[PDB]
Amino acid sequence: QAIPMTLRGAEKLREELDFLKSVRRPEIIAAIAEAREHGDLKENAEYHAAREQQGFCEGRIKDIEAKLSNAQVIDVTKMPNNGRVIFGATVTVLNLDSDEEQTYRIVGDDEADFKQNLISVNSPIARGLIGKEEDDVVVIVEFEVIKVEYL
């Protein structure tokens, strides 16, 4: 139960925990202190919006602590490039049919953002590539792993 997470991604998680803990949390409690000066809490809109945000953002905190409590932080920059796809690598794949060439970065779930070509290890494309190496054609259809870079 060690949970793989890249350095970029973990620094991004740790970044966040601070802003939420150090900037937003206070801001939210001052917002609540404030609307409390107006009593009638039941119908206090600014109070309910502030309390809403408190749950919203505190859950994100409880989450990041856990996430980071479980992490296995991988830095692929420190390993000799074998040409084999590992978790954290950057992979150029070529769709042998359409001839569609894309480069992706295999990452953990909190860091995953496929729209930004950052693919969660728990995805069909990461899965078909993980363990392959440049040249390996993989019938996941078929894509060719054009280049493996540890960045």
UniProtKB/Swiss-Prot annotation:
Keywords noted in UniProt: DNA-binding, Transcription, Transcription regulation
Residue intervals passing through the bilayer: none
Gene Ontology MF, one: bacterial-type RNA polymerase holo enzyme binding
InterPro entries, per the entry: GreA/GreB_C_sf (IPR036953), TF_GreA/GreB_CS (IPR018151), Tscrpt_elong_fac_GreA (IPR006359), Tscrpt_elong_fac_GreA/B (IPR028624), Tscrpt_elong_fac_GreA/B_C (IPR001437), Tscrpt_elong_fac_GreA/B_fam (IPR023459), Tscrpt_elong_fac_GreA/B_N (IPR022691), Tscrpt_elong_fac_GreA/B_N_sf (IPR036805)
Pfam families: GreA_GreB, GreA_GreB_N
Recorded GO CC terms: cytoplasm; cytosol
GO biological process entries: DNA-templated transcription elongation; regulation of DNA-templated transcription elongation
Similarity-based family: Belongs to the GreA/GreB family.
Cross-referenced HAMAP family: GreA_GreB
NCBIfam families associated with the record: greA, PRK00226.1-2, PRK00226.1-4, PRK00226.1-5
General function of this protein: Necessary for efficient RNA polymerase transcription elongation past template-encoded arresting sites. The arresting sites in DNA have the property of trapping a certain fraction of elongating RNA polymerases that pass through, resulting in locked ternary complexes. Cleavage of the nascent transcript by cleavage factors such as GreA or GreB allows the resumption of elongation from the new 3'terminus. GreA releases sequences of 2 to 3 nucleotides.
PANTHER family, sorted: TRANSCRIPTION ELONGATION FACTOR GREA
Protein name per Swiss-Prot or TrEMBL: Transcription elongation factor GreA
Organism in which the protein naturally occurs: Escherichia coli (strain K12)
